[PDB]
Amino acid sequence: MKEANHLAAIEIFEKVNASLLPQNVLDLHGLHVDEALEHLMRVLEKKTEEFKQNGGKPYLSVITGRGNHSQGGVARIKPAVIKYLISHSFRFSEIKPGCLKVMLK
């Protein structure tokens, strides 16, 4: 699944976020730039709130996918997401291929 990965990504994302959100993980590899951003933005804001209110994780591990380091399919989610973080003055740092770990503010 190179191309089909992008279509499968939606159903994967939905089933996956259920288990991944409590880890403070935002994993949406394969989604469109718009989709990825729209999901990321709403989760990031509510997670910031969960951080300051409920005492969740002080971070969010964003998986855009293994875009660039050891693998590379659709990595344009990464420049898109990066731009979102910087524009809001967030603190992030990539782990390894395409995985941006963001520290909540």
CSV table of C-alpha atoms in Angstrom, one decimal:
chain,number,residue,atom,x,y,z
A,1,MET,CA,0.0,0.0,0.0
A,2,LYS,CA,1.7,3.1,-1.3
A,3,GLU,CA,-1.3,4.8,-2.6
A,4,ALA,CA,-3.9,2.7,-0.9
A,5,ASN,CA,-2.1,3.6,2.3
A,6,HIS,CA,-3.5,7.0,1.9
A,7,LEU,CA,-7.0,5.7,1.7
A,8,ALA,CA,-6.6,3.1,4.4
A,9,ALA,CA,-5.1,5.9,6.6
A,10,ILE,CA,-8.5,7.3,7.4
A,11,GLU,CA,-9.9,4.0,8.9
A,12,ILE,CA,-6.6,3.3,10.5
A,13,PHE,CA,-6.5,6.8,12.1
A,14,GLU,CA,-10.0,6.4,13.5
A,15,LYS,CA,-9.3,3.1,15.1
A,16,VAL,CA,-5.8,4.0,16.1
A,17,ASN,CA,-6.5,7.4,17.9
A,18,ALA,CA,-8.7,5.6,20.4
A,19,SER,CA,-5.7,3.9,21.8
A,20,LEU,CA,-3.1,6.5,20.9
A,21,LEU,CA,-4.7,9.7,22.3
A,22,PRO,CA,-4.3,8.6,26.0
A,23,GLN,CA,-0.6,8.2,25.1
A,24,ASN,CA,-0.7,11.8,24.0
A,25,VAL,CA,-0.1,10.8,20.6
A,26,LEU,CA,-1.5,12.2,17.5
A,27,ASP,CA,-0.9,9.7,14.8
A,28,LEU,CA,-2.4,10.4,11.4
A,29,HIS,CA,0.0,9.2,8.9
A,30,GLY,CA,-1.4,8.9,5.4
A,31,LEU,CA,-4.0,11.6,5.7
A,32,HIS,CA,-4.3,14.6,3.4
A,33,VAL,CA,-2.6,17.8,4.4
A,34,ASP,CA,-6.0,19.4,5.2
A,35,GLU,CA,-7.2,16.4,7.1
A,36,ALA,CA,-4.1,16.0,9.0
A,37,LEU,CA,-4.0,19.6,10.0
A,38,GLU,CA,-7.7,19.8,10.9
A,39,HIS,CA,-7.4,16.7,13.1
A,40,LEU,CA,-4.1,17.9,14.6
A,41,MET,CA,-5.3,21.4,15.4
A,42,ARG,CA,-8.4,20.3,17.3
A,43,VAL,CA,-6.6,17.6,19.3
A,44,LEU,CA,-3.6,19.9,20.0
A,45,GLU,CA,-5.8,22.6,21.5
A,46,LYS,CA,-7.9,20.2,23.6
A,47,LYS,CA,-4.8,18.4,24.7
A,48,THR,CA,-3.2,21.7,25.8
A,49,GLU,CA,-6.3,22.1,27.9
A,50,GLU,CA,-6.0,18.5,29.2
A,51,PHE,CA,-2.4,19.3,30.1
A,52,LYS,CA,-3.3,22.5,32.1
A,53,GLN,CA,-6.5,21.2,33.5
A,54,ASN,CA,-6.4,17.4,34.0
A,55,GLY,CA,-2.7,17.0,34.1
A,56,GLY,CA,-2.1,14.9,31.0
A,57,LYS,CA,1.2,14.7,29.2
A,58,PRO,CA,3.2,17.9,28.7
A,59,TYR,CA,3.7,16.7,25.1
A,60,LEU,CA,2.1,15.3,22.0
A,61,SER,CA,3.9,12.9,19.8
A,62,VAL,CA,2.8,13.6,16.3
A,63,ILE,CA,3.3,10.9,13.8
A,64,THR,CA,3.0,12.3,10.3
A,65,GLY,CA,4.4,9.1,9.2
A,66,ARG,CA,7.8,7.9,8.4
A,67,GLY,CA,8.2,10.7,5.9
A,68,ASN,CA,11.9,11.2,5.9
A,69,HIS,CA,14.7,9.4,7.6
A,70,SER,CA,14.4,5.6,7.1
A,71,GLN,CA,11.4,5.6,4.8
A,72,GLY,CA,9.5,8.0,2.7
A,73,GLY,CA,6.1,8.0,1.1
A,74,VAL,CA,3.9,10.9,1.7
A,75,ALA,CA,5.9,13.3,3.8
A,76,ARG,CA,4.2,16.5,2.9
A,77,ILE,CA,2.2,16.2,6.1
A,78,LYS,CA,5.4,17.1,7.9
A,79,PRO,CA,6.1,20.6,6.2
A,80,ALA,CA,2.4,21.3,6.7
A,81,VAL,CA,2.3,20.4,10.3
A,82,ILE,CA,5.7,22.1,11.0
A,83,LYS,CA,4.3,25.3,9.7
A,84,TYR,CA,1.3,24.9,12.0
A,85,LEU,CA,3.5,24.5,15.1
A,86,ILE,CA,5.9,27.4,14.3
A,87,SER,CA,3.0,29.7,13.5
A,88,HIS,CA,1.7,29.1,17.0
A,89,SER,CA,5.2,29.3,18.6
A,90,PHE,CA,5.0,25.6,19.8
A,91,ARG,CA,8.0,23.6,20.8
A,92,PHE,CA,8.6,20.6,18.7
A,93,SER,CA,11.4,18.4,17.7
A,94,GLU,CA,11.4,15.4,15.3
A,95,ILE,CA,12.2,12.1,16.8
A,96,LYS,CA,13.3,10.1,13.8
A,97,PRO,CA,11.6,9.8,10.3
A,98,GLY,CA,8.8,12.3,10.2
A,99,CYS,CA,7.7,12.0,13.8
A,100,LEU,CA,7.4,15.4,15.4
A,101,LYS,CA,7.3,15.4,19.1
A,102,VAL,CA,5.6,18.6,20.3
A,103,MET,CA,5.9,20.0,23.8
A,104,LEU,CA,2.8,21.7,25.0
A,105,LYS,CA,2.7,25.3,26.0
